[PDB]
From Swiss-Prot, chain A:
Keyword Nucleus: yes
CC terms in the record's Gene Ontology section: nucleus; RNA polymerase II, core complex
Extra facts: Present with 4280 molecules/cell in log phase SD medium.
Annotated phenotype, changing L114P: Transcript termination readthrough
Protein's organism: Saccharomyces cerevisiae (strain ATCC 204508 / S288c)
PANTHER family xrefs: DNA-DIRECTED RNA POLYMERASE I,II,III, DNA-DIRECTED RNA POLYMERASE II SUBUNIT RPB11
Protein family (similarity comment): Belongs to the archaeal Rpo11/eukaryotic RPB11/RPC19 RNA polymerase subunit family.
Subcellular location: Nucleus
Gene Ontology molecular function: DNA binding; DNA-directed RNA polymerase activity; protein dimerization activity
Purpose: DNA-dependent RNA polymerase catalyzes the transcription of DNA into RNA using the four ribonucleoside triphosphates as substrates. Component of RNA polymerase II which synthesizes mRNA precursors and many functional non-coding RNAs. Pol II is the central component of the basal RNA polymerase II transcription machinery. It is composed of mobile elements that move relative to each other. RPB11 is part of the core element with the central large cleft. Seems to be involved transcript termination.
Lineage, uppermost ranks: Eukaryota, Fungi, Dikarya, Ascomycota, Saccharomycotina
Keywords from the UniProt entry: DNA-directed RNA polymerase, Nucleus, Transcription
Domain of life: Eukaryota
Protein name stated in the entry: DNA-directed RNA polymerase II subunit RPB11
UniProtKB/Swiss-Prot annotation, chain B:
Record key words, sorted: DNA-directed RNA polymerase, Isopeptide bond, Metal-binding, Nucleus, Ribosome biogenesis, Transcription, Ubl conjugation, Zinc
Binding site for Zn(2+): C7, C10, C45, C46
Binding partners and assembly: Component of the RNA polymerase I (Pol I), RNA polymerase II (Pol II) and RNA polymerase III (Pol III) complexes. Component of the RNA polymerase I (Pol I) complex consisting of 14 subunits: RPA135, RPA190, RPC40, RPA14, RPB5, RPO26, RPA43, RPB8, RPA12, RPB10, RPC19, RPC10, RPA49 and RPA34. The complex is composed of a horseshoe-shaped core containing ten subunits (RPA135, RPA190, RPB5, RPO26, RPB8, RPB10, RPC10, RPA12, RPC19 and RPC40) where RPA135 and RPA190 form the DNA-binding cleft.
InterPro entries in the cross-refs: RNA_pol_su_RPB10, RNA_pol_suN_Zn-BS, RPABC5/Rpb10
Cell compartments where the protein resides: Nucleus, Nucleolus
Other noteworthy facts: Present with 5300 molecules/cell in log phase SD medium.
An example Gene Ontology biological process: transcription initiation at RNA polymerase I promoter
Location, primary (coarse class): nucleus
Record's protein name: DNA-directed RNA polymerases I, II, and III subunit RPABC5
Gene: RPB10
One cellular-component annotation, GO: nucleus
Lineage per the UniProt record: Eukaryota, Fungi, Dikarya, Ascomycota, Saccharomycotina
Family, as annotated: Belongs to the archaeal Rpo10/eukaryotic RPB10 RNA polymerase subunit family.
From Swiss-Prot, chain C:
Record function comment: DNA-dependent RNA polymerases catalyze the transcription of DNA into RNA using the four ribonucleoside triphosphates as substrates. Common component of RNA polymerases I, II and III which synthesize ribosomal RNA precursors, mRNA precursors and many functional non-coding RNAs, and a small RNAs, such as 5S rRNA and tRNAs, respectively. RNA polymerases are composed of mobile elements that move relative to each other. In Pol II, the core element with the central large cleft comprises RPB3, RBP10, RPB11, RPB12 and regions of RPB1 and RPB2 forming the active center.
Record's keyword terms, sorted: DNA-directed RNA polymerase, Metal-binding, Nucleus, Peroxisome, Ribosome biogenesis, Transcription, Zinc, Zinc-finger
Identification of the protein by name: DNA-directed RNA polymerases I, II, and III subunit RPABC4
GO BP terms, alphabetized: nucleolar large rRNA transcription by RNA polymerase I; ribosome biogenesis; RNA-templated transcription; termination of RNA polymerase I transcription; termination of RNA polymerase III transcription; transcription by RNA polymerase I; transcription by RNA polymerase II; transcription by RNA polymerase III
GO molecular function: DNA binding; DNA-directed RNA polymerase activity; zinc ion binding
Note: Present with 907 molecules/cell in log phase SD medium.
Swiss-Prot record, chain D:
Protein localization: Nucleus
GO cellular component entries: nucleoplasm; nucleus; RNA polymerase II, core complex
Gene from which this protein is expressed: RPB3
Keyword entries, A-Z: Acetylation, DNA-directed RNA polymerase, Metal-binding, Nucleus, Transcription, Zinc
Organism from which the protein derives: Saccharomyces cerevisiae (strain ATCC 204508 / S288c) (Baker's yeast)
Main location: nucleus
Keyword Acetylation: yes
Shown part of the complete sequence: 3 to 268 of 318
Binding site for Zn(2+): C84, C86, C90, C93
Assembly: Component of the RNA polymerase II (Pol II) complex consisting of 12 subunits.
Full protein name: DNA-directed RNA polymerase II subunit RPB3
Amino acid sequence: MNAPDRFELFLLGEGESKLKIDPDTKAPNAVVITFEKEDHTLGNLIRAELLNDRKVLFAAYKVEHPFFARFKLRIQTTEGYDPKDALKNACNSIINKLGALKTNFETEWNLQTL
Amino acid sequence: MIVPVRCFSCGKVVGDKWESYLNLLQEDELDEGTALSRLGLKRYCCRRMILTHVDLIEKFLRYNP
Amino acid sequence: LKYICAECSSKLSLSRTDAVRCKDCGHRILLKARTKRLVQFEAR
Amino acid sequence: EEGPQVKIREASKDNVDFILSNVDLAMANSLRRVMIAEIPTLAIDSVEVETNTTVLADEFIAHRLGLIPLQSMDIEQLEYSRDCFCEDHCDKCSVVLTLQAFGESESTTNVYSKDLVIVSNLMGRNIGHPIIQDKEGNGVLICKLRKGQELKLTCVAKKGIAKEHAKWGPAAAIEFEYDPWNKLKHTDYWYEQDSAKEWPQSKNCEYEDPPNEGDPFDYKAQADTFYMNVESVGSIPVDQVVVRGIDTLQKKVASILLALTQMDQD
Ligand SMILES: [Zn+2]
Ligand SMILES: [Zn+2]
Ligand SMILES: [Zn+2]
């Protein structure tokens, strides 16, 4: 009756952009990025992959409300390091690990029976 | 009513397992636990899904209209 | 329009100024037939 | 290869029991989530009921029709109905299959999933065919007809994500367990007398070395070894479930990366 459509969990609305980059006003050289139509599946992974980068001071994601499929990711890096590059490096690292995992699983599957 | 097509909890297909369950019960004269075990229902949620079910459609088919 | 009986399989087409009862039956319980304009269902 | 490792312990048509090595917890969890909800699948989305003199209600039948496992092998070369430039649905996005059953014999006439007949043009793509892992070869029991009861309807199946409805769920239960000895101490065991005798011992204990009481707690250890068992429903093979899970996660990361590439526009 008042329940929202299901596709509003992954389909972007009217004018809604996928990422919203905002200059964090708290601490210098920090940023808060709004991910639309995404959940913990992406947030937790990216945040955990940002903490691997030792040039990243702060990195934390949160879902302000379970009703809506969106989450905010705050990133703070050292001076001389634009956080977008940290996000990009994190993402590419994720993609590489996943690709390697796919190749490995395939090669391991090609050796099985039944 | 009729046997639920898939298990609520996980999502395993248990709609094709009803008649086979009945056969394992009356034809092979097994108990419910072993019958459920043979049908590949290891988790107790699906095991529940079949064991707990009551086929009411057989009583519904008793009407002529 | 057309109507079908309750306790027997028939297919009466008696419109207004007719009503009850049925054709070769004896009971007055009459149900109405399903619409020709089909309705869709979201299998969810 | 060079990164994360896989060790297939058991392998069959329905299940894959393997060990994930050299991976972060969040990646294993995310992989599990994607495998559960974010993998594309073909299932009945629309039902057009012509005649229905069965016991079950219309949408009652439509519902369990929706849950029927359909072939989703070449689902990737099928398209979302919301993307296709057609009116409502076509052959490039949807698979239409009819159902015509009628009570014949005096005995109860069963209506299975095998009675579904593909009508729309598949044009080569392996898709739409209802999965039958049944021994007799019948499949999912859809309905039951009496002597003169008829069920005639038409199903339109569309590509969907399990995040939108659990009917598009390619997998069922995914087993997931790390550190069978609680050496990371992520769990404080509840007990009445003894902590070890009360709590059952996991199978996956066979693949790791027990802790020595002479050894202190390892506070600098993380989670590397994971024990997973992925079970498919039939719509998509297990190996393809985990692989397309991986590729889906990868693709939706690449979409964020691409978005970052796009936000540099004036
Ligand atoms: Zn279950
Ligand atoms: Zn009559
Ligand atoms: Zn189309």
